[PDB]
Structure 1
């Protein structure tokens, strides 16, 4: 496959089709789908490692939407990227002024 060729897990060939049919440009370069697939897998693996720590402190085994909210609001770079987003059944951060 084209994902094994680049050392990746996400699908390179599916991302190539979504770029060709999304009305972005007339032509798509050969390395464009490979670059964008590696950035997507890095961001997923990163948000998934922070939400696993949150669960492994409460001695929980399965990740629930509350754990995703704590990881994002507690991180400086993720909080600014996702600053206009609402997580369903997430809650708030504990805080008493």
Structure 2
């Protein structure tokens, strides 16, 4: 399974990893940080979508 769906989530991981890789935010990057961004933004999106419903 790809990294965008290995954790069973909704938001893509490769998209935010490509955004930080060329956005020049650090020298290196840990493996847990893009999926952590994935989890935080998908939880914020799900909460505001439940409130929108």
TM-score, length-scaled by structure 2: 0.87
Question: Which ranges in structure 1 are unaligned for 5 or more consecutive residues?
Answer: 53-97
- Give the secondary structure class of the aligned counterpart of 1:8: coil
Task: Provide runs of 4+ in structure 1 moved above 3 Å.
Answer: none
Question: Which ranges in structure 2 are unaligned for 5 or more consecutive residues?
Answer: none
More strand by share: 1
TM-score, length-scaled by structure 1: 0.50
From the CA coordinates, give the structure whose radius of gyration is larger. Answer: 1
Q: Report the Cα offset of residue 3 of structure 1.
A: 2.5
Structure 2 contact 11–38 (Cα < 8 Å) conserved:
yes
Q: Report the Cα offset of residue 4 of structure 1.
A: 1.9
Structure 2 contact 5–12 (Cα < 8 Å) conserved:
no
Alpha-carbon RMSD across the aligned residues, in angstroms, is: 0.9
